[PDB]
XYZ file of N, CA, C and O in Angstrom:
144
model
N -95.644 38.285 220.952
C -96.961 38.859 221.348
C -97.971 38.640 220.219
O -97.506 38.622 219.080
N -99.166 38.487 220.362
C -100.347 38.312 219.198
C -100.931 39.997 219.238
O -100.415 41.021 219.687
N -102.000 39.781 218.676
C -102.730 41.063 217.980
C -102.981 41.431 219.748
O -102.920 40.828 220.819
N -103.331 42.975 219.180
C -103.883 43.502 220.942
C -105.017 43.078 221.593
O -105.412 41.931 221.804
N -105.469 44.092 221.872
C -106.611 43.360 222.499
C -107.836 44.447 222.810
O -108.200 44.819 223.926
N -108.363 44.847 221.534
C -109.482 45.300 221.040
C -110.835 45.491 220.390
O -111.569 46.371 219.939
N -110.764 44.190 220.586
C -111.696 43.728 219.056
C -112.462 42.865 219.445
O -112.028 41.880 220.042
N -113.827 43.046 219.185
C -115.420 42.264 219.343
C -114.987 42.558 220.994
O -114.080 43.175 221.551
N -116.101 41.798 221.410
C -116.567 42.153 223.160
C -116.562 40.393 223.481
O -115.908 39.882 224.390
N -117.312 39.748 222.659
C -117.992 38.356 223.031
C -116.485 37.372 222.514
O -116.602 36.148 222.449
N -115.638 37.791 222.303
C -114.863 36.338 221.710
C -113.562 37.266 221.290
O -113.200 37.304 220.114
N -113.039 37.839 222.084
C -111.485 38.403 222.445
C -110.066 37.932 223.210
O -108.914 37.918 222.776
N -110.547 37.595 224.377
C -109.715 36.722 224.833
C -110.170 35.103 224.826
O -110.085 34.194 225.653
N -110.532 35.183 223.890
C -110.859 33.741 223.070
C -109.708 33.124 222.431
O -109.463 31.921 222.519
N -109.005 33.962 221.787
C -107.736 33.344 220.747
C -106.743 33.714 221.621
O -105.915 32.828 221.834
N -106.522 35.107 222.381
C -105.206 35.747 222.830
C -104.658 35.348 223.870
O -103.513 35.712 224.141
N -105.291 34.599 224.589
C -104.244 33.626 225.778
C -103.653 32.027 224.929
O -102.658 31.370 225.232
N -104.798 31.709 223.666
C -104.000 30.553 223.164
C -103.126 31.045 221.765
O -102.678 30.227 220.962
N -102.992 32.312 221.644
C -102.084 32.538 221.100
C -100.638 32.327 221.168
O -99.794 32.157 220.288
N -100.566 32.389 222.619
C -99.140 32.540 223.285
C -99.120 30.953 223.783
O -98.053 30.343 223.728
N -100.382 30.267 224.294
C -99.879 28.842 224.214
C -101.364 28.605 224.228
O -102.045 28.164 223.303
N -101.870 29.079 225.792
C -103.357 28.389 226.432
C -103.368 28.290 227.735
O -102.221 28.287 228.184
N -104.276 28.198 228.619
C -104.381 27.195 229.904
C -104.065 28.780 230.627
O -103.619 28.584 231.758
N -104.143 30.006 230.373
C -103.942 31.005 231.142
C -102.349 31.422 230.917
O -101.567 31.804 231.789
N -102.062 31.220 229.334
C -100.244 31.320 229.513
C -101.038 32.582 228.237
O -101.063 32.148 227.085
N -101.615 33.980 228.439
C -101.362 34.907 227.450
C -103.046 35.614 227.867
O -104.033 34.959 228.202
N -102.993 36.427 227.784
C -103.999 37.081 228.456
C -104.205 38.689 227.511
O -103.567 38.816 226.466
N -104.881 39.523 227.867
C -104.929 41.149 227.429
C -104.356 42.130 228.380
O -104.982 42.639 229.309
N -102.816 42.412 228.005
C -102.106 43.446 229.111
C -102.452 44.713 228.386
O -101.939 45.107 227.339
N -103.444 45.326 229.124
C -103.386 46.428 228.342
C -103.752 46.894 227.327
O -104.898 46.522 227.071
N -103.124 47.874 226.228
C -102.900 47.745 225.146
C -102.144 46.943 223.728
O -102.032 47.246 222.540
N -101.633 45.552 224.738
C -100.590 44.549 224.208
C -101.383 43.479 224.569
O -101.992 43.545 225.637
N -101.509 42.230 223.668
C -101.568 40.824 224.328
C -100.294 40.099 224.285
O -99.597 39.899 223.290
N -100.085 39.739 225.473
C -98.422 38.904 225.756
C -98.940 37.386 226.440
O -100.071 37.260 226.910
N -98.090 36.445 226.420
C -98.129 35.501 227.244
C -97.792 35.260 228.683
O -96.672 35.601 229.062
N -98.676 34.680 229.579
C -98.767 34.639 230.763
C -96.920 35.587 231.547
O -96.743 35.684 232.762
């Protein structure tokens, strides 16, 4: 899992879906960011 998913408004799920790879494989569940 990468960092959660709290932080700035404009550029958050910017890194946290290509954390886990990209292309929609990692997203913001919640209080967790996990991969697709």
């Amino acid at each position: 899992m990468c960092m959660p998913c709290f932080t700035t408004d404009h550029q958050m799920a910017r890194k946290c879906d290509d954390c886990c790879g990209g292309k929609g494989r990692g997203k913001c569940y919640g209080p967790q960011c996990l991969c697709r």
